[PDB]
Amino acid sequence: KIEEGKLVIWINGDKGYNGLAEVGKKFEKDTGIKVTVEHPDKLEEKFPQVAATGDGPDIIFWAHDRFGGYAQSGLLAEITPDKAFQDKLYPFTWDAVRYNGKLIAYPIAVEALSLIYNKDLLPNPPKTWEEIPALDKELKAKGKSALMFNLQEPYFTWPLIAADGGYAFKYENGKYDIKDVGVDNAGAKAGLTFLVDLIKNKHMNADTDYSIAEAAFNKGETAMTINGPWAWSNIDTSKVNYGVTVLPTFKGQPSKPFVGVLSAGINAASPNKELAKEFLENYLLTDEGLEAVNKDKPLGAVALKSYEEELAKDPRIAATMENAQKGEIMPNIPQMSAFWYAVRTAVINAASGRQTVDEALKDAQTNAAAEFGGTVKNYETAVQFCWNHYKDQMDPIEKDWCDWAMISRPYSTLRDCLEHFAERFDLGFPNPLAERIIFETHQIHFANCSLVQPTFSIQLGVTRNKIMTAQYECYQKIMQDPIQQAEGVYCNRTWDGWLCWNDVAAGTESMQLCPDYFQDFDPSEKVTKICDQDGNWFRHPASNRTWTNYTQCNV
């Protein structure tokens, strides 16, 4: 339900929204139309949710990579820039917002990641990734670090993953082949192994996010970060003596950042489509409009020729375009959401040890491909995909279903597939459908095995083997007991991901010892799981997900 006679605009919280609001004030002064600029969290996921019911903003700003998905879902208005207006913007910026031959958004500015370095801490930047460990050892002796950047968004790690041969989709002869994906190849593995090694060697921390890296760089604690033009405003405020420069090489090859074009789409459901056109063409995409936004947070290399020429001599913009030239323009195709979720999952899981680099990238490509081809659309279809993949591995090895050495990798991959898709569809793991699938493999594949414990006649790693062995024991016995094991109202037995819980009486704070899975777990400390007065397991209030309390294990 979008209000006629005004404009609501969504733009990301790292962009110049105060400068965009100034453009909105000038619009209001000439037209009497109020412009509201908002920067909701997760706006790239929020926009398709709310727009799918005819709700949301009149105008949505994001890099062009998300817009094909929006277009395919019918969420975008057709845009109708005449030829004189198109001539005012660079052809390659229009190309970024052309999907199936149609312009689907207005391009605003070209963004690429650069290496940003503290010239006082580090007089010359490193030419290579390989030299960063030695540089960190020197800086650690002085209470500093070499490098901090966002490890939660795969955008920031992609330049290193792509350097030696990682790619999204094969683009040739003007078309993308979504059956030719470059996430699970020797180049992607080399890059992500280098990143995981930086973490294992304590040069970087898997938990570092955008805000932690920005604060550390802007306080002078770290010599280097990786960021885009929008970040320069807060560094200027900090008074750090900074350089913006070419990203370091990996295995002698350039880092290859995915190049974004900040773009503006008009909501299909907007009753304000002509107002939106007027605002974007005659107010924003002018020298005066882009200056107001750029003065708030730098845009990078703007799509408007006349203002790009004016800013072109900024060495920070020169370094931006040098990094852009070495990278690739992101595809705008509908498959980009599934692509980024899969690479997000691979980087987070590999950085935190939840998967090896090979498992992480192999699973990311397999599971993304399940979405790319339209099979998986929701958790029910995801679970059928995970089950079918698992059955295909299990059917040829039937004589060995009671051999842990033969079934432990398939069994582990089934759990990883169920967890990948649970998070993809904003479910907890475990969840009722996932529990039912794991119960089914115990009924179909393991029912004739003589033991509760796995028996045996590149195995899983030490920690993953302990976790999966424990899971297998849980489903062999506690999960299969035919009758209720706690009198009266009770919370149902569950495998929580790390530990097995039996049926527990309503109104009990159940306790077990911390598992021996991690070197930082104290095996004499306690895990708690609360069963409420209605026989429902406790849900953490921040998440509303069913939640076991492991917080005492690593204090």
Binding site: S352, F429, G497, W498, D516, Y517, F518, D520, F521, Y550
Partner: peptide, 16 residues
């Protein structure tokens, strides 16, 4: 060897 560090995401409210 055994993993050095329990994943913080899995201890937090969106984890196990």
């Amino acid at each position: 060897d055994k993993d050095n560090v329990a994943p913080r995401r899995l201890i937090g409210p969106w984890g196990y």
